[PDB]
Amino acid sequence: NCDIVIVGGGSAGSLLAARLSEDPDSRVLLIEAGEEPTDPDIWNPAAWPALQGRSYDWDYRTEAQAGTAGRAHHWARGRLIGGSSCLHAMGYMRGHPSDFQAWVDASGDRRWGWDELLPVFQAIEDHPLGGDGIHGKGGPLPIHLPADEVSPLARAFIEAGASLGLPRLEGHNSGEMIGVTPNSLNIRDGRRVTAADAWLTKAVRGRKNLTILTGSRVRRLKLEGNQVRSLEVVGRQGSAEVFADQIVLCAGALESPALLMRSGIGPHDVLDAAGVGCLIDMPDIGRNLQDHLLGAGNLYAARKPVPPSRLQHSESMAYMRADSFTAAGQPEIVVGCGVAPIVSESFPAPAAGSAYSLLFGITHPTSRGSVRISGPELGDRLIIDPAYLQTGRDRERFRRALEASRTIGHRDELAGWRERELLPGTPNSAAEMDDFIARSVITHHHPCGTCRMGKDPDAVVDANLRLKALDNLFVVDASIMPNLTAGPIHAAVLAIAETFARQYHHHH
Numbered sequence: 001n002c003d004i005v006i007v008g009g010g011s012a013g014s015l016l017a018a019r020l021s022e023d024p025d026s027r028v029l030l031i032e033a034g035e036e037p038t039d040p041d042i043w044n045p046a047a048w049p050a051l052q053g054r055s056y057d058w059d060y061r062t063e064a065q066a067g068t069a070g071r072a073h074h075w076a077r078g079r080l081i082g083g084s085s086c087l088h089a090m091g092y093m094r095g096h097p098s099d100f101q102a103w104v105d106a107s108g109d110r111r112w113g114w115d116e117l118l119p120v121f122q123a124i125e126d127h128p129l130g131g132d133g134i135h136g137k138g139g140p141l142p143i144h145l146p147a148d149e150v151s152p153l154a155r156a157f158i159e160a161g162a163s164l165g166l167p168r169l170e171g172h173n174s175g176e177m178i179g180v181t182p183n184s185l186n187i188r189d190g191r192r193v194t195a196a197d198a199w200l201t202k203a204v205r206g207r208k209n210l211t212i213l214t215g216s217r218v219r220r221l222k223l224e225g226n227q228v229r230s231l232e233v234v235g236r237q238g239s240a241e242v243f244a245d246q247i248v249l250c251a252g253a254l255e256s257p258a259l260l261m262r263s264g265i266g267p268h269d270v271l272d273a274a275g276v277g278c279l280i281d282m283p284d285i286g287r288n289l290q291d292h293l294l295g296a297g298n299l300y301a302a303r304k305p306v307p308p309s310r311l312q313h314s315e316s317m318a319y320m321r322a323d324s325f326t327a328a329g330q331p332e333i334v335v336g337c338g339v340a341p342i343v344s345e346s347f348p349a350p351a352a353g354s355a356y357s358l359l360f361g362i363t364h365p366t367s368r369g370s371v372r373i374s375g376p377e378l379g380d381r382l383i384i385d386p387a388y389l390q391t392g393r394d395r396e397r398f399r400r401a402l403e404a405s406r407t408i409g410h411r412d413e414l415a416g417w418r419e420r421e422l423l424p425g426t427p428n429s430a431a432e433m434d435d436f437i438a439r440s441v442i443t444h445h446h447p448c449g450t451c452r453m454g455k456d457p458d459a460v461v462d463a464n465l466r467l468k469a470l471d472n473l474f475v476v477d478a479s480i481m482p483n484l485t486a487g488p489i490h491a492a493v494l495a496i497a498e499t500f501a502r503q504y505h506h507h508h
């Protein structure tokens with residue numbers, strides 16, 4: 001209610017609603033644009049792709065991308081309690097320690113380093129290796145290490161990678177991320193487990209100091225001096241003004257910057273062009289946009305029927321250096337085993353069961369894009385330019401990734417499954433490879449960076465996640481990430497939320 005308002009009930013928001021309200025002297029209101037879940041397919045891990053295009057998916061469309069053969073891309077996003085966590089591939093990857101070293105350099109604060117994050121990840125995790133001093137034990141989020149249920153295709157892929165020199169890992173989360181392993185998953189008893197499941201339990205929801213408001217969109221934050229004084233909330237019925245002492249934005253990589261721009265906080269020139277009065281000129285709001293790509297894909301005809309995944313279809317990412325299968329350290333590329341024959345819209349889909357794809361990507365793209373509001377209204381679509389493949393480094397590294405994928409794909413360890421390669425076949429030059437890659441890449445679903453945390457004067461938030469231009473507004477979601485982690489970012493978003501919860505309880 002009165003003390004703190006959380007905008008957006010997604011991954012970070014669900015965690016915060018629970019954690020902030022642990023203080024009985026704190027009144028917490030959670031405002032979510034979507035509805036509570038009712039669709040049962042949501043908890044079926046193997047149904048995650050079918051979830052897209054449904055009612056609770058924002059379904060943004062990017063600008064045409066010159067670096068991906070002029071293709072425009074669809075960006076699925078959760079619009080319901082639990083957010084993008086409902087739509088997940090449910091992979092759990094903390095990231096690599098060096099990923100977070102970059103956050104430390106950017107933020108000027110040690111709290112964002114692997115060593116300090118370690119107890120934070122551990123507080124979040126309920127992991128089967130919990131107790132080893134590295135992984136968490138007894139935390140709200142189950143982490144599952146698949147073994148028996150791993151697809152024989154995925155095991156064959158893992159063997160192919162292992163034969164090449166990649167070490168065998170138990171999940172990606174020990175601080176060592178390069179190697180071969182089934183992906184760790186947020187699954188318990190065969191059921192997907194979301195942020196909302198883990199943190200917004202029946203007990204938490206029963207707290208008299210926690211109020212959850214659904215089907216309600218925050219349209220503008222209203223200012224008085226150097227503070228946010230109230231929020232304008234738009235519901236199925238009409239609009240209403242909500243007051244608060246502290247405001248935390250958890251609307252995610254697209255919607256957090258959009259809310260700020262609608263409120264007249266952002267690039268003066270962007271707001272002008274959107275017809276929004278400028279109250280605080282912050283040039284970096286909406287900028288620094290990053291995302292991961294996967295090439296869809298190194299497609300193989302199967303020598304025998306490919307049986308449906310007993311997990312989540314994309315069962316094993318192999319992170320590695322771009323120039324060697326034996327070298328250790330921070331990942332540069334990734335090749336993943338897709339039990340489903342996944343291809344972009346640029347290719348015809350093979351019959352089900354008849355093919356599998358190896359997905360290939362780069363782990364730390366240097367390209368940087370932007371999100372801008374097109375007008376003042378909730379209904380005015382965002383202008384999203386991820387700037388995919390715009391740097392020479394990103395393009396060169398993706399050649400390395402495709403090359404790594406084909407090397408793994410053609411190993412004897414996969415001869416039991418492989419009939420022959422369907423894609424890319426025979427690219428005989430850099431340009432031909434570049435063209436196939438540009439036609440094949442799709443989003444890995446990890447948008448972030450649009451409200452970047454930094455120690456420099458024009459960063460959007462400081463190391464405490466406070467919007468630099470105001471006293472009582474915080475941004476606590478994927479938008480603050482200075483840079484992408486090597487792999488999927490949900491663990492990182494949750495780590496961001498937990499460290500902010502700890503900071504709030506520490507200073508109040």
Ligand SMILES: Cc1cc2nc3c(=O)[nH]c(=O)nc-3n(C[C@H](O)[C@H](O)[C@H](O)COP(=O)(O)OP(=O)(O)OC[C@H]3O[C@@H](n4cnc5c(N)ncnc54)[C@H](O)[C@@H]3O)c2cc1C
Nearest residue numbers: 008010011012033083084089090091218252255478488490
């Ligand atoms: C299909 C898919 C699969 C994925 N798979 C994985 C995976 O396997 N592993 C992994 O690590 N990551 C994965 N991700 C990414 C991960 O889910 C997100 O990075 C993470 O959930 C980001 O959380 P967040 O709190 O920043 O935003 P979100 O979880 O997206 O939450 C934003 C919430 O705020 C609400 N909201 C937005 N605007 C407003 C407003 N104006 N007023 C009120 N409410 C608002 C939205 O409805 C939403 O509920 C996947 C993403 C997608 C789309």
Ligand SMILES: Cc1ncc(CO)c(CN)c1O
Nearest residue numbers: 089090091314443444445488
């Ligand atoms: C397209 C896609 N494939 C596989 C995975 C497995 O982690 C993810 C999750 N980001 C994904 O988005």
